[PDB]
Design a protein around this ligand. Structure first.
Ligand SMILES: Nc1ccc(-c2ccccc2C(=O)O)cc1
Ligand SMILES: [Cl-]
Ligand SMILES: [Cl-]
Ligand SMILES: [Cl-]
Ligand SMILES: [Cl-]
Ligand SMILES: [Mg+2]
Length: 345
């Protein structure tokens, strides 16, 4: 067991191992400090979870997040450097701290303030898909891909972060970037969704890197739907049969029919192979979208594709999600995962 020291920062008591030095508040699910990790030599982010076991829903969300972060081991995905509690027994266990690499700029800063060549777009989207192939191979859905959840460094290397761990209604209302990257079937709850929602998000992001502008900046759910259908066309009978809500089907059939537009006249001057890939991502029927593994083999990435260096994940057991347990049982499961953590090399 390491030696811990205590300190109050912005009316919060932090108790952390001696290896973490020069704690500096950064932001506030929990509060976050920047720190220097003397064991690894890295600048790190230390997150103290806020009330992790207040209710059954919160306790299960705490367990879900810890299981997910412990599993992710890939160059293009955020990983867990450390997890600790100052408690010495389960009976006094109450606080959870997570440690990750400190991230600097996100894709927002780059897209808004930099001139991007086609080679830049190729490399950035390639890395997103390489991480997604890994994530989807474990039957995990990210659910919240958007520019602010993608970290980029000085060498244009990219990491996916901030997995969707189950957003409020107010957060998705109005003219908000938290909705502009979501697939229409999940934005309007048309049907049970799957991992293909993430590929829709990648298409929205790729289009924004090419033009410098948000693809579907709707002012509300319905305005956004109209922008989407003007580009990709209104649904045909095949997809309407797959929409579970009769009222959603009724609403769709109230709209005048529209053909799919010519993407070369939308993305003027773009690499024709980029246009081709966008048409395969931004497909309304989610059954027919290109997958991450298929997209990596597309000719647009010929400069970077290496099938021997695009790994898949170890199997991931999510059976706990259908389990009904009491707070103290979720809390005991979490305690076991903290004490069994083994750090990376
Ligand atoms: N191969 C590779 C992949 C991602 C990163 C990276 C990206 C953004 C922020 C930080 C990092 C990093 O880990 O240094 C670096 C190297
Ligand atoms: Cl504690
Ligand atoms: Cl964003
Ligand atoms: Cl019509
Ligand atoms: Cl597992
Ligand atoms: Mg985020």
């Amino acid at each position: 067991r390491p030696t811990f020291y205590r300190q109050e920062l912005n009316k919060t008591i932090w108790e952390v191992p001696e290896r973490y030095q020069n704690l500096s508040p950064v932001g506030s699910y929990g509060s976050v400090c920047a720190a220097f990790d003397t064991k690894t030599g890295h600048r790190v982010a230390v997150k103290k979870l806020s009330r992790p076991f207040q209710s059954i829903i919160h306790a299960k969300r705490t367990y879900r997040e810890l299981r997910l972060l412990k599993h992710m081991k890939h160059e293009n995905v955020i990983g867990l450097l450390d997890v600790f509690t100052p408690a010495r027994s389960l009976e006094e266990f109450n606080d959870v701290y997570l440690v990750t690499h400190l991230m600097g700029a996100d894709l927002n800063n780059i897209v808004k303030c930099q001139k991007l060549t086609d080679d830049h777009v190729q490399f950035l989207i390639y890395q997103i898909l390489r991480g997604l192939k890994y994530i989807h191979s474990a039957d995990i859905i990210h659910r919240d891909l958007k520019p602010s959840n993608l970290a980029v460094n000085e060498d244009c290397e990219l990491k996916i972060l901030d997995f969707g761990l189950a957003h409020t209604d107010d957060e998705m209302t109005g003219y908000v970037a938290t909705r502009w990257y979501r697939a229409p079937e999940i934005m309007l709850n048309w049907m049970h969704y799957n991992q293909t929602v993430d590929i829709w998000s990648v298409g929205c992001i790729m289009a924004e890197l090419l033009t410098g502008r948000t693809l579907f900046p709707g002012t509300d759910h319905i305005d956004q739907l109209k922008l989407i259908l003007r580009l990709v066309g209104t649904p045909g009978a095949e997809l309407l049969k797959k929409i579970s809500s009769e009222s959603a089907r009724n609403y769709i059939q109230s709209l005048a029919q529209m053909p799919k537009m010519n993407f070369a006249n939308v993305f003027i001057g773009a690499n024709p192979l980029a246009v081709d890939l966008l048409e395969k991502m931004l497909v309304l029927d989610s059954d027919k979208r290109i997958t991450a593994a298929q997209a990596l083999a597309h000719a647009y990435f010929a400069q970077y594709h290496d099938p021997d260096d695009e790994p898949v994940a170890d199997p991931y057991d999510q059976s706990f999600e259908s389990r009904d347990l009491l707070i103290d049982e979720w809390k005991s499961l979490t305690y076991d995962e903290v004490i069994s953590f083994v750090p990376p090399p």
